[PDB]
Amino acid sequence: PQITLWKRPLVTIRIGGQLKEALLDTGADDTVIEEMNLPGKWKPKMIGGIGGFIKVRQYDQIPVEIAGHKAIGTVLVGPTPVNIIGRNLLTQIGATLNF
Amino acid sequence: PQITLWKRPLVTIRIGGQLKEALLDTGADDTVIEEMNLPGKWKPKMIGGIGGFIKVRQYDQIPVEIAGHKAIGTVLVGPTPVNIIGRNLLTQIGATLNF
Ligand SMILES: CC[C@H](C)[C@@H]1NC(=O)[C@@H](NC[C@@H](O)[C@H](Cc2ccc(O)cc2)NC(=O)[C@H](C(C)C)N2CCCC2=O)Cc2ccc(cc2)OCCCNC1=O
């Protein structure tokens, strides 16, 4: 799909067998999902953007379906204002910026 | 041009007569530029990132050139680690997300 930026680039994803809305964020190195229960082990981590640092749970090798496209990677779960799909998963589905 | 996401999408921009490196952020509603002495009238504003909010100064109708592409719009100046080009300016240069 070719997505324009007149509106926030939000898409439906499926993670942990659950449907959610996430933002395709080219300015994010990583993927940060709102607090939820994900199968498997996790290691505590700390990330920081504008506004400050937050504590997150790091889940590895998690399957995520973005708009029908499969990806399997690291997902950070924490107190984020929005679900963010970062470059680690965007590269897996072959997403690019064009102008 | 087509930009892959293996690395952060950093490009050269021109603002206030100066050249800077900025991140193309599809997850940013606004454009946030690092602290600089831009002339003109402004208004206080608070924007939120992943870890909280920061105080910024809002400047309107600021001419910004992105990768040789002219644009003009609102720029928020504040204490940011990186210059961020948001959707308000990306739409003007016809940027899209494709996968
Ligand atoms: C500041 C940019 C704009 C203003 C902001 N958008 C972003 O920050 C969006 N993009 C995040 C991106 O700007 C930001 C840029 C950046 C890069 C390196 C740094 O050292 C510091 C900041 N990236 C990150 O915060 C990501 C994080 C999401 C994993 N980080 C942290 C360090 C490395 C990295 O990539 C994400 C978001 C979207 C909506 C949000 C909050 C956050 O709430 C709704 C409110 C609207 N907020 C926004 O539109």
The position carrying tokens 């395709």 is A24
Residue A88: DSSP 8-state? H
Residue A81 CA: nearest ligand 1 atom is: 43
Q: How far is the CA of B13 from the CAs of A20, B40, B41, B75, in angstroms?
A: 35, 20, 22, 13
User: A53: which chain B residues are within 8 Å (Cβ-Cβ)?
Assistant: 51
CA distance A63 to A71: 6
Angle at the Cα of B76 (from B74 to B80), degrees rounded to 5? 150
Amino acid at B48: G
Distance in angstroms (rounded) separating the CA atoms of residues B74 and A28? 22
Q: Which domain holds residue B84?
A: 1-99
Residue among B29, B54, B67 minimizing CB distance to A50: B54
Strand partners, B64: B15, B71
Nearest-CA distance B90 → chain A (Å): 7
Question: In whole angstroms, what is the distance from residue A87 CA to residue B9 CA?
Answer: 10
How crowded is residue B60: how many other Cβ atoms within 10 Å of its Cβ?
Answer: 12
CB A14 within 8 A of CB A64: yes
Q: Which residues line ligand 1 (CB under 6 A)?
A: A 23, 25, 27-30, 32, 47-50, 81-82, 84, 86; B 25, 27-30, 32, 47-50, 81-82, 84
Q: Domain holding A79: CATH number?
A: 2.40.70.10
Neighbouring residues of A69: CB distance < 8 A, sequence distance ≥ 6: A93, B99
Angle at the Cα of A34 (from A33 to A36), degrees rounded to 5?
A: 100
B92: which DSSP letter?
Answer: T
Q: How far apart are CA B1 and CA B67, in angstroms?
A: 10
Question: Resolution of this entry in Å?
Answer: 1.9
DSSP labels, A53-76? EEEEEEEEEEEEEETTEEEEEEEE
**Residue A40 phi, psi (nearest 5):** 95, 175
Give the 3-state DSSP-derived string for B5-73, with helices as H, strands as E and coil as C. Answer: CCCCCEEEEEECCEEEEEEECCCCCCCEEECCCCCCCCEEEEEECCCCEEEEEEEEEEEEEECCEEEEE
How would you class B86 by CB atoms within 10 Å of its CB: exposed for 0-12, middle for 13-18, buried for 19 or more? buried
Say how many domains are in chain B. 1
